[PDB]
Design a protein around this nucleic acid. Structure first.
Ligand SMILES: *O[P@@](*)(=O*)O(*)[C][C][C]1O[C]([C])[C]([O])[C]([O])[C]1[O]
Ligand SMILES: *O[P@@](*)(=O*)O(*)[C][C][C]1O[C]([C])[C]([O])[C]([O])[C]1[O]
Ligand SMILES: *O[P@@](*)(=O*)O(*)[C][C][C]1O[C]([C])[C]([O])[C]([O])[C]1[O]
Ligand SMILES: *O[P@@](*)(=O*)O(*)[C][C][C]1O[C]([C])[C]([O])[C]([O])[C]1[O]
Ligand SMILES: [Ca+2]
Ligand SMILES: [Ca+2]
Ligand SMILES: [Ca+2]
Ligand SMILES: [Ca+2]
Ligand SMILES: [Ca+2]
Ligand SMILES: [Ca+2]
Ligand SMILES: [Ca+2]
Ligand SMILES: [Ca+2]
Ligand code: NA
Ligand code: NA
Ligand code: NA
Ligand code: NA
Lengths: 114, 114, 114, 114
DNA sequence: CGCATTTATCGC
DNA sequence: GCGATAAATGCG
DNA sequence: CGCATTTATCGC
DNA sequence: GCGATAAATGCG
DNA sequence: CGCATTTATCGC
DNA sequence: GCGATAAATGCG
DNA sequence: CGCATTTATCGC
DNA sequence: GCGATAAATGCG
């Protein structure tokens, strides 16, 4: 199924964060309404932050995360969690290799902010 | 109920990350087996990373997250999510004020690494 | 923090389901906009369904779940999960005793329907 | 990625529940260690329970859920959630059609029991 | 015509 | 913890 | 004034 | 897999 | 050799 | 809320 | 006595 | 994508 696509409230400030756990060079791309809004690129095998950002839903709220590595797009896993019906997490994993750990690029979206 | 306490596999490398969304000065404390293992302190209202870290479960796996602010401990919300039965997230929110947004200190644990 | 309270889209059909895992007699109560909409009562220690139902968000969407047992309200744990940004789960646990398993009354809300 | 596969503690009692939200006739199949352990079959478009069951992890814990409809296997979405580090949910959605609601067969595993 | 007027939410 | 902000009728 | 008119979503 | 449904101007 | 002996967890 | 249950040395 | 010996997992 | 790693009997 379609992974890494989330609908958050229209025109809402949120935070994006990505980590790396692979020898491959992660090209994390964050779209908003099918528009590129941010691009993190880095390499790590020790869960290093390759990018943080504050963005805006726009006035759809269609945030999507794509993860390419060296050109080859990765396969994605995603979910959204809400605590106390206020604090939201949007979680994205990704696999570039074959050992199925899906941590090569870990993306964490969260909102509300402030 | 008890929040911010997680049991991850014995002796396993994981990553801890904290953000701030409050005028209050977040004192994030990360215990392992009731031992302090890491202490992040910072202030932000723009979801800034106040700390990243690679730690070890030890040989219980009892990771706990506590969040004090200016002395006053915050109330916590927590959950653990697993994708494709391999990639784990342990999420912690916290409230220091009264507006119940619970984003003042957002803590994100993830594993496996590498 | 406040548990067992969820905001789902205005005027939306969803399903409620409750289970029992305690010698105590679970009085599961499902409010909508602070109005009682359904009341399941039963007893089991073998995860028996004590009630299923199709309800409507109304035109707020404030669905709340309360769990009393023999009069004494239980302490609640809750979260909401979304898969493929379409299929929603709202999960509620509850504790009437002291052994902290929180399965005495397990409540599962899901939507969309059809 | 691989969906509908969960690893729960060895030799542990849990509950399986399935719902239906499609004109298609859902053949929910629940394997344990790649052994069929339970088979629910039913039809509904009003979120009807097509099966409940108490099973055992066995001594691997590899519980898998497969969903065929009229022969054609469905595409799956899955996740596991844990509250207060005690109460576990394993959630499975599935799509037999093309409208991508993924509620046609909703499967809910939960543990511990008692 | 467009543009000010009239307590829950967002932003530093 | 604070203050600035924003479907109908009236008006420039 | 209220009430029909004009492709994405919900319901059996 | 199918069909019925629903911010502005026009009208009864 | 196999089989009883010696406080956290599971089952009705 | 209750009680029955289960890595080493000793033994039948 | 302790210490090497004998394909799924973790670490850079 | 790679290689180093780790319940019983044997032995120093
Ligand atoms: O696909 P191949 O060139 O390899 C890379 C594997 C990659 O890095 C290693 C360290 C591991 O973490 C794996 O999960 C990644 O996919
Ligand atoms: O409790 P009081 O001194 O205030 C602080 C509120 C705090 O900061 C603001 C910006 C808001 O984000 C709120 O959520 C925090 O609790
Ligand atoms: O609080 P006390 O009268 O007891 C009841 C415990 C109750 O039932 C048992 C079976 C157990 O499952 C526990 O979790 C429940 O709280
Ligand atoms: O695939 P086609 O024969 O159709 C069936 C659609 C099916 O039922 C309807 C009611 C809807 O709920 C859809 O989600 C299901 O896939
Ligand atoms: Ca990988
Ligand atoms: Ca990896
Ligand atoms: Ca706050
Ligand atoms: Ca805040
Ligand atoms: Ca209990
Ligand atoms: Ca119980
Ligand atoms: Ca469908
Ligand atoms: Ca359906
Ligand atoms: Na006033
Ligand atoms: Na037409
Ligand atoms: Na004794
Ligand atoms: Na060999």
């Amino acid at each position: 199924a379609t992974q890494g696509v989330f609908t958050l409230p229209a025109n809402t400030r949120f935070g994006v964060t990505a980590f790396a756990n692979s020898s491959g060079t992660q090209t994390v791309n964050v779209l908003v309404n099918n528009e590129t809004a941010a691009t993190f690129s880095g390499q790590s095998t020790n869960n290093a932050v390759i990018g943080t950002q504050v963005l805006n839903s726009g006035s759809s709220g269609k945030v999507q995360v794509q993860v390419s590595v060296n050109g080859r797009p990765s396969d994605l896993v995603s979910a959204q969690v809400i605590l106390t019906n206020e604090l939201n997490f949007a979680l994205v994993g990704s696999e570039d290799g074959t050992d199925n750990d899906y941590n090569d690029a870990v993306v964490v979206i969260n909102w509300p902010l402030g």
